[PDB]
Amino acid sequence: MISVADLDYASRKSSIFLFAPHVGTFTKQSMDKLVRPLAASAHRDWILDTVAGLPTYWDALAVKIPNIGNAIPGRRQLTDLDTWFRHGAGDVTQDDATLPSIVVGPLVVLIQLTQYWRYLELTRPDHLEDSADLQADVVTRQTQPGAKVETLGFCAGLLAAVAVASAGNRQEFQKYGAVAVRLAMMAGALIDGQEARDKATRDGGSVSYAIAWRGQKPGEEAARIVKDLNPNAYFAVLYDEARATVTTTRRTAPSLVNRLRAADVTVAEIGIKGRIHSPDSERKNNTDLLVDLCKSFEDLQYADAASLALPTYNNEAEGRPVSRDRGNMTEMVIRAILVNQCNWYGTFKGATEGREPFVVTLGLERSVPPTLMRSLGPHQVHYEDLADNGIPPAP
Numbered sequence: 001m002i003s004v005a006d007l008d009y010a011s012r013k014s015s016i017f018l019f020a021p022h023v024g025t026f027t028k029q030s031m032d033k034l035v036r037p038l039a040a041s042a043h044r045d046w047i048l049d050t051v052a053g054l055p056t057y058w059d060a061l062a063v064k065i066p067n068i069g070n071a072i073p074g075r076r077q078l079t080d081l082d083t084w085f086r087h088g089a090g091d092v093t094q095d096d097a098t099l100p101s102i103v104v105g106p107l108v109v110l111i112q113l114t115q116y117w118r119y120l121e122l123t124r125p126d127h128l129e130d131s132a133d134l135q136a137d138v139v140t141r142q143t144q145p146g147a148k149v150e151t152l153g154f155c156a157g158l159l160a161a162v163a164v165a166s167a168g169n170r171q172e173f174q175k176y177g178a179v180a181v182r183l184a185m186m187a188g189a190l191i192d193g194q195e196a197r198d199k200a201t202r203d204g205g206s207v208s209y210a211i212a213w214r215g216q217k218p219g220e221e222a223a224r225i226v227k228d229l230n231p232n233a234y235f236a237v238l239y240d241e242a243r244a245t246v247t248t249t250r251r252t253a254p255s256l257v258n259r260l261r262a263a264d265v266t267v268a269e270i271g272i273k274g275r276i277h278s279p280d281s282e283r284k285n286n287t288d289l290l291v292d293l294c295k296s297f298e299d300l301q302y303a304d305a306a307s308l309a310l311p312t313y314n315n316e317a318e319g320r321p322v323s324r325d326r327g328n329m330t331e332m333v334i335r336a337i338l339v340n341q342c343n344w345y346g347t348f349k350g351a352t353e354g355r356e357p358f359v360v361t362l363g364l365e366r367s368v369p370p371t372l373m374r375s376l377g378p379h380q381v382h383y384e385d386l387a388d389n390g391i392p393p394a395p
Helices: 029-041 044-052 054-064 072-087 100-124 135-140 157-166 168-201 216-228 253-262 281-295 329-336 344-352 369-377
Strands: 014-019 146-155 206-212 234-240 244-250 266-270 358-362 381-382
Touching: 014 100, 014 157, 029 044, 029 072, 029 100, 029 266, 044 054, 044 072, 044 168, 054 072, 054 168, 054 281, 072 100, 072 168, 100 135, 100 168, 100 358, 135 168, 146 157, 146 344, 157 168, 157 329, 168 281, 168 329, 206 234, 206 253, 216 234, 216 253, 234 344, 234 369, 244 253, 253 266, 281 329, 344 369
Parallel strands: 014 146, 014 358, 358 381
Antiparallel strands: 206 244, 206 266, 234 244
């Protein structure tokens, strides 16, 4: 545990707010520990308003994409989510089932956004009240020496990162935060729906593994093994120089694991179920439909790429924030998460190389590639490690 007072954040050259991906799963019990402080916080009213509205967006999604609408009880999952925040979960000890992405996506967006706001509060200038518009302040000061700010999302972290980058003040933080929650729900539904459909087949649903090798050659063998298991298996995330996340169907998982291990590749199962960053034809078609649907809702839009309040990144290793002509940010985020490979290693190296940014990770998973963490030295912090990092109850 580290105190904000011990970070020397005041001596930073710049900041990158890194919004983490999902990795591990949640139960009602484990998630309740995070939901309760959210529900008790100053964010309560805007959270409730946002979550109350989700079933309407689910309805539209179900009409647009009947294969997803018929596959999962999306409405029930979302009405239960509303009750969870509004009235409480009740006994969370009963069911050890992992929560679906249609709910975890929205919840993790909220966790990340509230951590971000609390970080601004903990590090705010001495003259500012804790009730001040902290977003307006960091955005206004971003031109001062040593006050540059960028946001950098990793997979689902893109939803929160782009919300913050779109927001010039508190009102816009709430507006674009709500957009992010809705998009997270919808992306989660596509993942969950395909998973339910897959489980009804011999191939089964999908699972993912964090893998690691040593050297060029063993990496090539790992790639060969995954390719041989195409299209069941694929590389979802390129995480570090010699680390990746691979996803495959349950049917082929033992084969994948056993062949990788025989090739001297370490393999560790991660929690998240389903297929993310997926090249599947069904996923491509569903994503095209979701993109079309989002175009029809003003309330599903982020700021335009030419109008962001702060710079932000995709996960395609550009070496710089997305260009001002990149256009529709909702489409970029949806495609980046649902279909496009996540080149995290290249993205993170690109965002940090030749610079000395203070990297602050929001979320619940450690996100800085080990080979690149060393060079960041002391100018980094993972939010979970901070003292007094609870979301404060409403004043």
